[PDB]
């Protein structure tokens, strides 16, 4: 007879995820300022990471945190992002204190907990931008043309964050990045 796995195995996550950190430095290419922190694929390992790193609200302006499925780099150029887009959450200066941190954690939980159910395969990850003019959080998806998946993900995400329902958020395609209107709204 063998031991009861319930008493000792870590609680597995559907996907293995990777957390990245971005430190702004004008003298270097965007990609050069983007570096991996570490990866994890269990509930225990997620908290071990989250608990020892600074809350988004404490980072220096210009820095980002990005949680993307293992194998998908948090950039437009990636095979899994080039044809996709993002649901953007735009926060005001007051929300840095009131909602940024709780919104980001809920975002992390939505990702690792596969809260988008049937459309989990369309989800790539999420990014939080700490900025002086106003912080930003966003869920990135793989194909801007998958209306069904994209709209359902947006609705679910918006409901999970729990902000006033009357507030509309938009979805923008990465390819449409101005050298930017929304494709969908919920
Ligand atoms: C997500 N992303 C951001 N950048 C670079 O980062 C710059 C800033 O893009 P940003 O997404 O970090 O928002 P920010 O608020 O800092 O600035 P703004 O929206 O223009 O006011 C871009 O114009 C790019 O030069 C990126 N550059 C490359 N090559 N690939 C990416 O995926 C990528």
PDB file of N, CA and C in Angstrom, residues 92-129:
ATOM      1  N   UNK A  92      -7.334  55.018 -12.667  1.00  0.00           N
ATOM      2  CA  UNK A  92      -7.017  56.421 -12.424  1.00  0.00           C
ATOM      3  C   UNK A  92      -5.994  56.469 -11.295  1.00  0.00           C
ATOM      4  N   UNK A  93      -5.380  57.632 -11.082  1.00  0.00           N
ATOM      5  CA  UNK A  93      -4.360  57.777 -10.045  1.00  0.00           C
ATOM      6  C   UNK A  93      -4.807  57.369  -8.646  1.00  0.00           C
ATOM      7  N   UNK A  94      -6.097  57.507  -8.353  1.00  0.00           N
ATOM      8  CA  UNK A  94      -6.603  57.133  -7.034  1.00  0.00           C
ATOM      9  C   UNK A  94      -6.678  55.615  -6.875  1.00  0.00           C
ATOM     10  N   UNK A  95      -6.909  54.913  -7.980  1.00  0.00           N
ATOM     11  CA  UNK A  95      -7.016  53.458  -7.953  1.00  0.00           C
ATOM     12  C   UNK A  95      -5.714  52.713  -7.640  1.00  0.00           C
ATOM     13  N   UNK A  96      -4.586  53.417  -7.676  1.00  0.00           N
ATOM     14  CA  UNK A  96      -3.290  52.807  -7.352  1.00  0.00           C
ATOM     15  C   UNK A  96      -3.411  52.242  -5.929  1.00  0.00           C
ATOM     16  N   UNK A  97      -3.974  53.058  -5.041  1.00  0.00           N
ATOM     17  CA  UNK A  97      -4.176  52.700  -3.643  1.00  0.00           C
ATOM     18  C   UNK A  97      -5.383  51.791  -3.414  1.00  0.00           C
ATOM     19  N   UNK A  98      -6.498  52.106  -4.061  1.00  0.00           N
ATOM     20  CA  UNK A  98      -7.726  51.346  -3.866  1.00  0.00           C
ATOM     21  C   UNK A  98      -7.945  50.026  -4.613  1.00  0.00           C
ATOM     22  N   UNK A  99      -7.582  49.952  -5.890  1.00  0.00           N
ATOM     23  CA  UNK A  99      -7.856  48.728  -6.639  1.00  0.00           C
ATOM     24  C   UNK A  99      -6.711  48.001  -7.337  1.00  0.00           C
ATOM     25  N   UNK A 100      -5.623  48.693  -7.644  1.00  0.00           N
ATOM     26  CA  UNK A 100      -4.527  48.050  -8.370  1.00  0.00           C
ATOM     27  C   UNK A 100      -4.101  46.679  -7.862  1.00  0.00           C
ATOM     28  N   UNK A 101      -3.709  46.620  -6.598  1.00  0.00           N
ATOM     29  CA  UNK A 101      -3.242  45.368  -6.025  1.00  0.00           C
ATOM     30  C   UNK A 101      -4.306  44.279  -5.953  1.00  0.00           C
ATOM     31  N   UNK A 102      -5.528  44.625  -5.568  1.00  0.00           N
ATOM     32  CA  UNK A 102      -6.546  43.584  -5.494  1.00  0.00           C
ATOM     33  C   UNK A 102      -6.980  43.136  -6.889  1.00  0.00           C
ATOM     34  N   UNK A 103      -6.966  44.058  -7.852  1.00  0.00           N
ATOM     35  CA  UNK A 103      -7.325  43.724  -9.233  1.00  0.00           C
ATOM     36  C   UNK A 103      -6.260  42.804  -9.842  1.00  0.00           C
ATOM     37  N   UNK A 104      -4.992  43.099  -9.578  1.00  0.00           N
ATOM     38  CA  UNK A 104      -3.924  42.271 -10.122  1.00  0.00           C
ATOM     39  C   UNK A 104      -3.981  40.857  -9.535  1.00  0.00           C
ATOM     40  N   UNK A 105      -4.165  40.737  -8.223  1.00  0.00           N
ATOM     41  CA  UNK A 105      -4.231  39.404  -7.619  1.00  0.00           C
ATOM     42  C   UNK A 105      -5.405  38.601  -8.173  1.00  0.00           C
ATOM     43  N   UNK A 106      -6.547  39.258  -8.381  1.00  0.00           N
ATOM     44  CA  UNK A 106      -7.716  38.567  -8.917  1.00  0.00           C
ATOM     45  C   UNK A 106      -7.412  38.116 -10.340  1.00  0.00           C
ATOM     46  N   UNK A 107      -6.630  38.922 -11.055  1.00  0.00           N
ATOM     47  CA  UNK A 107      -6.239  38.592 -12.421  1.00  0.00           C
ATOM     48  C   UNK A 107      -5.356  37.340 -12.386  1.00  0.00           C
ATOM     49  N   UNK A 108      -4.386  37.323 -11.476  1.00  0.00           N
ATOM     50  CA  UNK A 108      -3.498  36.173 -11.339  1.00  0.00           C
ATOM     51  C   UNK A 108      -4.311  34.910 -11.044  1.00  0.00           C
ATOM     52  N   UNK A 109      -5.278  35.033 -10.138  1.00  0.00           N
ATOM     53  CA  UNK A 109      -6.122  33.907  -9.756  1.00  0.00           C
ATOM     54  C   UNK A 109      -7.016  33.425 -10.898  1.00  0.00           C
ATOM     55  N   UNK A 110      -7.486  34.353 -11.729  1.00  0.00           N
ATOM     56  CA  UNK A 110      -8.324  33.994 -12.871  1.00  0.00           C
ATOM     57  C   UNK A 110      -7.512  33.160 -13.851  1.00  0.00           C
ATOM     58  N   UNK A 111      -6.252  33.540 -14.039  1.00  0.00           N
ATOM     59  CA  UNK A 111      -5.361  32.824 -14.950  1.00  0.00           C
ATOM     60  C   UNK A 111      -5.019  31.415 -14.462  1.00  0.00           C
ATOM     61  N   UNK A 112      -4.387  31.323 -13.292  1.00  0.00           N
ATOM     62  CA  UNK A 112      -3.975  30.027 -12.771  1.00  0.00           C
ATOM     63  C   UNK A 112      -5.132  29.116 -12.379  1.00  0.00           C
ATOM     64  N   UNK A 113      -6.293  29.706 -12.120  1.00  0.00           N
ATOM     65  CA  UNK A 113      -7.450  28.908 -11.759  1.00  0.00           C
ATOM     66  C   UNK A 113      -8.293  28.560 -12.974  1.00  0.00           C
ATOM     67  N   UNK A 114      -7.808  28.936 -14.156  1.00  0.00           N
ATOM     68  CA  UNK A 114      -8.512  28.672 -15.412  1.00  0.00           C
ATOM     69  C   UNK A 114      -9.978  29.105 -15.323  1.00  0.00           C
ATOM     70  N   UNK A 115     -10.208  30.327 -14.848  1.00  0.00           N
ATOM     71  CA  UNK A 115     -11.560  30.853 -14.682  1.00  0.00           C
ATOM     72  C   UNK A 115     -12.338  31.118 -15.974  1.00  0.00           C
ATOM     73  N   UNK A 116     -11.672  31.024 -17.121  1.00  0.00           N
ATOM     74  CA  UNK A 116     -12.350  31.274 -18.384  1.00  0.00           C
ATOM     75  C   UNK A 116     -12.863  29.996 -19.039  1.00  0.00           C
ATOM     76  N   UNK A 117     -12.861  28.927 -18.250  1.00  0.00           N
ATOM     77  CA  UNK A 117     -13.361  27.612 -18.648  1.00  0.00           C
ATOM     78  C   UNK A 117     -13.134  27.169 -20.094  1.00  0.00           C
ATOM     79  N   UNK A 118     -14.225  27.023 -20.838  1.00  0.00           N
ATOM     80  CA  UNK A 118     -14.177  26.581 -22.228  1.00  0.00           C
ATOM     81  C   UNK A 118     -13.235  27.360 -23.130  1.00  0.00           C
ATOM     82  N   UNK A 119     -12.930  28.597 -22.764  1.00  0.00           N
ATOM     83  CA  UNK A 119     -12.063  29.408 -23.606  1.00  0.00           C
ATOM     84  C   UNK A 119     -10.655  29.593 -23.061  1.00  0.00           C
ATOM     85  N   UNK A 120     -10.256  28.703 -22.158  1.00  0.00           N
ATOM     86  CA  UNK A 120      -8.934  28.765 -21.546  1.00  0.00           C
ATOM     87  C   UNK A 120      -7.784  28.729 -22.543  1.00  0.00           C
ATOM     88  N   UNK A 121      -7.980  28.025 -23.653  1.00  0.00           N
ATOM     89  CA  UNK A 121      -6.935  27.918 -24.664  1.00  0.00           C
ATOM     90  C   UNK A 121      -6.644  29.227 -25.380  1.00  0.00           C
ATOM     91  N   UNK A 122      -7.607  30.143 -25.373  1.00  0.00           N
ATOM     92  CA  UNK A 122      -7.409  31.432 -26.028  1.00  0.00           C
ATOM     93  C   UNK A 122      -6.642  32.412 -25.147  1.00  0.00           C
ATOM     94  N   UNK A 123      -6.586  32.130 -23.845  1.00  0.00           N
ATOM     95  CA  UNK A 123      -5.887  32.998 -22.898  1.00  0.00           C
ATOM     96  C   UNK A 123      -4.381  32.754 -22.917  1.00  0.00           C
ATOM     97  N   UNK A 124      -3.611  33.833 -23.007  1.00  0.00           N
ATOM     98  CA  UNK A 124      -2.156  33.725 -23.033  1.00  0.00           C
ATOM     99  C   UNK A 124      -1.539  34.111 -21.691  1.00  0.00           C
ATOM    100  N   UNK A 125      -2.064  35.180 -21.094  1.00  0.00           N
ATOM    101  CA  UNK A 125      -1.564  35.661 -19.816  1.00  0.00           C
ATOM    102  C   UNK A 125      -2.085  37.061 -19.541  1.00  0.00           C
ATOM    103  N   UNK A 126      -1.436  37.783 -18.626  1.00  0.00           N
ATOM    104  CA  UNK A 126      -1.847  39.142 -18.278  1.00  0.00           C
ATOM    105  C   UNK A 126      -0.655  40.029 -17.925  1.00  0.00           C
ATOM    106  N   UNK A 127      -0.843  41.334 -18.075  1.00  0.00           N
ATOM    107  CA  UNK A 127       0.215  42.297 -17.795  1.00  0.00           C
ATOM    108  C   UNK A 127      -0.247  43.490 -16.964  1.00  0.00           C
ATOM    109  N   UNK A 128       0.536  43.863 -15.955  1.00  0.00           N
ATOM    110  CA  UNK A 128       0.197  45.044 -15.171  1.00  0.00           C
ATOM    111  C   UNK A 128       1.281  46.094 -15.422  1.00  0.00           C
ATOM    112  N   UNK A 129       0.866  47.298 -15.828  1.00  0.00           N
ATOM    113  CA  UNK A 129       1.796  48.402 -16.084  1.00  0.00           C
ATOM    114  C   UNK A 129       1.685  49.430 -14.954  1.00  0.00           C
TER     115      UNK A 129
END
